[PDB]
Design an enzyme around this catalytic site. Structure first.
Site, mmCIF file in Angstrom:
data_model
loop_
_atom_site.group_PDB
_atom_site.id
_atom_site.type_symbol
_atom_site.label_atom_id
_atom_site.label_comp_id
_atom_site.label_asym_id
_atom_site.label_seq_id
_atom_site.Cartn_x
_atom_site.Cartn_y
_atom_site.Cartn_z
ATOM 1 N N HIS B 92 0.809 -1.231 0.000
ATOM 2 C CA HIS B 92 0.000 0.000 0.000
ATOM 3 C C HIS B 92 0.844 1.285 0.000
ATOM 4 C CE1 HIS B 92 1.059 0.192 4.246
ATOM 5 N NE2 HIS B 92 0.589 1.429 4.259
ATOM 6 N N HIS B 119 0.332 9.247 -3.737
ATOM 7 C CA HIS B 119 1.184 8.075 -3.521
ATOM 8 C C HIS B 119 0.370 6.797 -3.668
ATOM 9 C CE1 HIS B 119 -0.284 9.030 0.565
ATOM 10 N NE2 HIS B 119 -0.265 7.723 0.761
ATOM 11 N N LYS B 196 -3.310 2.351 9.792
ATOM 12 C CA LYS B 196 -3.251 3.276 10.921
ATOM 13 C C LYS B 196 -2.804 2.584 12.208
ATOM 14 C CE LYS B 196 -6.621 6.689 9.226
ATOM 15 N NZ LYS B 196 -7.974 7.274 9.495
ATOM 16 N N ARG B 236 -17.043 -4.572 19.509
ATOM 17 C CA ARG B 236 -17.938 -4.832 20.615
ATOM 18 C C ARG B 236 -18.165 -3.547 21.381
ATOM 19 N NH1 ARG B 236 -17.730 -9.904 24.481
ATOM 20 N NH2 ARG B 236 -18.946 -8.279 25.579
ATOM 21 N N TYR B 258 2.988 15.325 13.500
ATOM 22 C CA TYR B 258 2.736 15.603 12.083
ATOM 23 C C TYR B 258 2.591 17.113 11.847
ATOM 24 C CZ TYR B 258 1.406 10.611 12.464
ATOM 25 O OH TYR B 258 1.389 9.257 12.763
ATOM 26 N N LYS B 261 5.805 22.406 14.371
ATOM 27 C CA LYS B 261 6.212 23.693 13.776
ATOM 28 C C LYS B 261 7.515 23.607 12.973
ATOM 29 C CE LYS B 261 4.693 27.435 16.837
ATOM 30 N NZ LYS B 261 5.102 28.788 17.339
#
Ligand SMILES: Nc1nc2c(ncn2[C@@H]2O[C@H](COP(=O)(O)OP(=O)(O)OP(=O)(O)O)[C@@H](O)[C@H]2O)c(=O)[nH]1
Ligand SMILES: Nc1nc2c(ncn2[C@@H]2O[C@H](COP(=O)(O)OP(=O)(O)OP(=O)(O)O)[C@@H](O)[C@H]2O)c(=O)[nH]1
Ligand SMILES: [Zn+2]
Ligand SMILES: [Zn+2]
Lengths: 449, 459
Positions: B92, B119, B196, B236, B258, B261
């Site tokens: 991926h 990408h 993730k 659940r 991410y 600064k």
């Protein structure tokens, strides 16, 4: 003042002087040199570089001396000593070449068997170049240091005695009443220094190997006492358990990681590719004069630009001259590796010396197996890599009466052989050669399987 | 069956087919692209690369699909399915360029404002190149896979519906009765996928941030159940606290790392150097044909050779025509960085599009301040980057389907972090003297004002 967030040490803060020294081409260089060499090609998590490891050592070295400063004012440990011990910890690894120990441990010996080169020497040379190219000496003074004494001190903590080669005091950076400061960053009296603490923890963290040891506890309890009429760093022996855990971690990192079989075969494949590229790769040094990988160590300006990147400059080259080099790296990528032939070790405590490495494959192809055989091999068909390497060697003190000392598998060299020829015919031959070679040198008989 | 020891996931078992895909110059390439781009220059632990992350994702994919199948065999998840999901997990990120999100997120839009690059698109193109360059198709058949269909399925899981569309089941690789397989590797609908899971964990590990989400609990309790006569992956009820912890982890990573600064200023510095190097660096593609950094994406053979290495090639270069590019990287090392000017947001306003990135420094320099200054500033003096989270603003928690241990087939009907797709806008100035910075701010405030972006908040 500046704060870094580190996965091992949490929030650590750097004196402006340290930051100056860090923000420099000579230092930043260390972001492009893998801590574990080809270990990354076996351990996907071992992507870490000499840089972060070096911030860590500079930090721990600061923690230790400062701890002893608050806990024993009589020792007379100044802020100036803390900075110096921090710079030494910070810079101790500047000398490291492409893929760390691969470079001075195997490649330079194979490339120039006649030169005596270590990464520590390179650290002192690269540090001299660092301060001279960035005007650090006045900045040191601005923060209290005395260059014509302290630079010796920093270099000594990194390479050992400078005017070496008896019982007298060899060091010029600090007097003998401060001998214990030379034990912080690099220490041969123990297998205990703030360097090892950092990379044990750091390598464990990135490898996925259990770390048993708690440096943070050791710094709080450690202190300086008199032992055989000198000053040494001593441990509260309620921490002997911690010391044992450290050595167990050291042994695990060696068995599982550093001496790993495929990781080490790859290190010799990278060297092979470098050796076959040495004539062609150019590294511009001081004055515009061009160097080779194997020679860049004689010019710090060129060495500054000599990093792991040389792997990809070869991988990506188009020059037909580098095709052989290119090809070995590609075999790494397809994982068509050199095949393992066997292992042995000298009897006993005779260590093969770096200057003789290059002659070993010739020696192995020269062996005459008892039974004559199908295939013939040549020196080039063999790789020979030499792999190198209690708690009563430690000083302890007592909490109540905190005064002076309360002190009452192996081995040192593995030798492994691989073959570049991969078919069963040639691989059978190689083993026969190897077994004979081991006899001809009276090494231990290899074990089958 | 190779075992890889990973620091996040322990022993990772790799099927022979996956190993063949990994031992490839196309896959191995990912060892030379840092996961967090210039993040490394701020977080000394952030040395990790796209390679190991991708191993992590393929492994996670395998774990989820296997656990679903072993718990509910009526789903008829075959081992053919699992491998396909694993391969998708694995490949991926194949299309990432130098320094990851910096490449398609900023550089390509700045260098070629008119191309539509991604990408994800890259990964599909790199996947094809990998297969054809390495005789993978027979090796797939060797293990039960159907190359035509299954290669199409793997590409769908990476980039989404390939030929669409305006209401019918959009995929071709698997039928709708296996729809739950498309929610594994990437799920935009509710922000829960195994991609993730890995980089949340892996980035936290490397940054020294605590990850409060346990992906192992989640796999243990996940189930396929029915939601609107379409089969979904469900958590659940009892697990809801773990999920909150996953969204708080996500948020901390964006806030702390991410959106860092200094780390983003360095991103725009590296991008600047590439832009000034782009006329001079050559990458040999298919047929000895040569490409730039900005055109290597048009030829996967050349793209293969385009990695973070280009940073060092510029840095170590002696060519006089790369001097400017060199200079910018040298200033990163000396840490003489672009100076920070301010932040704003397009709240209420149309979001800035990548096609317009390049035109923004000219807008800022053309936004004459109302009080006049003796310092005038030009476009070349300004940097403006647009930072996107950006999953496109919804709440993904409201799309998680839950089930109860009493009625494990029915999804429970059900009616926490704040933003999930905010566009941030930041300006930096290349001049560092205090009067130029006072000016730059004045231009910046004016720009926001007449662009109707939020008023910047007092230094
Ligand atoms: N194929 C592959 N293995 C990797 C990679 N990265 C790390 N590894 C690990 O390193 C090992 C590769 O060497 P092996 O094939 O297992 O060793 P071997 O060929 O069976 O044995 P020897 O010939 O004695 O070296 C694997 O067992 C993995 O655990 C990779 O990128 N590709
Ligand atoms: N000086 C320095 N800081 C680093 C480095 N690596 C990581 N850092 C960290 O990254 C953060 C960024 O700090 P700086 O790079 O010095 O940013 P700055 O001082 O605001 O630079 P300017 O924008 O030019 O004003 C810091 O809070 C440090 O924790 C390094 O190599 N040098
Ligand atoms: Zn070290
Ligand atoms: Zn990913």
């Amino acid at each position: 003042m500046k704060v870094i967030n580190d996965p091992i040490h949490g929030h650590i803060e750097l004196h402006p002087l340290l930051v100056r020294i860090i923000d420099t081409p000579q230092f930043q260089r260390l972001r492009y040199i893998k801590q574990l060499g080809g270990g990354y090609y076996v351990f996907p998590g071992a992507s870490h570089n000499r840089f972060e490891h070096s911030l860590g050592v500079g930090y721990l070295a600061g923690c230790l001396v400062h701890a002893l400063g608050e806990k024993q004012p009589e020792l007379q440990i100044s802020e100036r000593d803390v900075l110096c011990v921090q710079i030494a910890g910070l810079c101790h690894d500047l000398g490291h070449g492409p893929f760390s120990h691969m470079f001075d441990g195997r490649f330079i010996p194979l490339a120039r068997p006649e030169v005596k080169w270590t990464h520590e020497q390179g650290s002192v040379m690269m540090f001299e170049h660092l301060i001279n190219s960035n005007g650090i000496k006045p900045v040191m003074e601005q923060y209290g240091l005395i260059p014509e004494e302290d630079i010796y001190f920093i270099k000594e903590q990194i390479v050992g005695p400078l005017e070496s080669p008896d019982s007298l005091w060899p060091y010029k950076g600090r007097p003998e009443n401060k001998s214990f400061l030379y034990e912080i960053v690099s220490n041969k009296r123990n297998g205990i220094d703030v360097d090892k603490w950092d990379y044990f923890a750091r390598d464990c963290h990135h490898l996925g190997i259990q770390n048993n040891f708690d440096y943070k506890r050791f710094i709080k309890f450690a202190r300086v006492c008199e032992v055989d009429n000198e000053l040494r760093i001593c441990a509260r022996d309620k921490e002997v358990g911690n010391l044992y855990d450290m050595f167990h971690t050291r042994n695990s990192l060696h068995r599982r990681a550093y001496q790993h079989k495929v990781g080490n075969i790859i290190d010799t494949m990278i060297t092979d590719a470098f050796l076959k590229a040495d004539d062609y790769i150019e590294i511009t040094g001081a004055g515009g004069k061009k160097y080779r990988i194997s020679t860049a160590i004689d010019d710090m300006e060129a060495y500054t630009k000599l990093t792991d990147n040389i792997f990809l400059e070869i991988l990506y080259s188009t020059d037909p001259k580098l095709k052989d080099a290119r090809e070995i790296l590609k075999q790494i990528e397809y994982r068509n590796l050199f095949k393992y032939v066997g292992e042995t070790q000298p009897t006993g405590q005779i260590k093969i010396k770096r200057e003789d490495y290059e002659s070993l494959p010739k020696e192995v192809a020269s062996a005459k197996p008892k039974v004559l055989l199908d295939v013939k091999l040549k020196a080039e068909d063999f790789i020979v890599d030499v792999i190198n390497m209690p708690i009563d060697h430690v000083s302890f003190y007592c909490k109540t009466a905190p005064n002076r000392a309360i002190r009452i598998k192996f081995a040192e060299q593995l030798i492994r052989v691989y073959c570049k020829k991969v078919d069963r015919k040639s691989l059978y031959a190689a083993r026969q050669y190897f077994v004979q070679w081991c006899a001809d040198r009276n090494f231990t008989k290899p074990q089958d399987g």
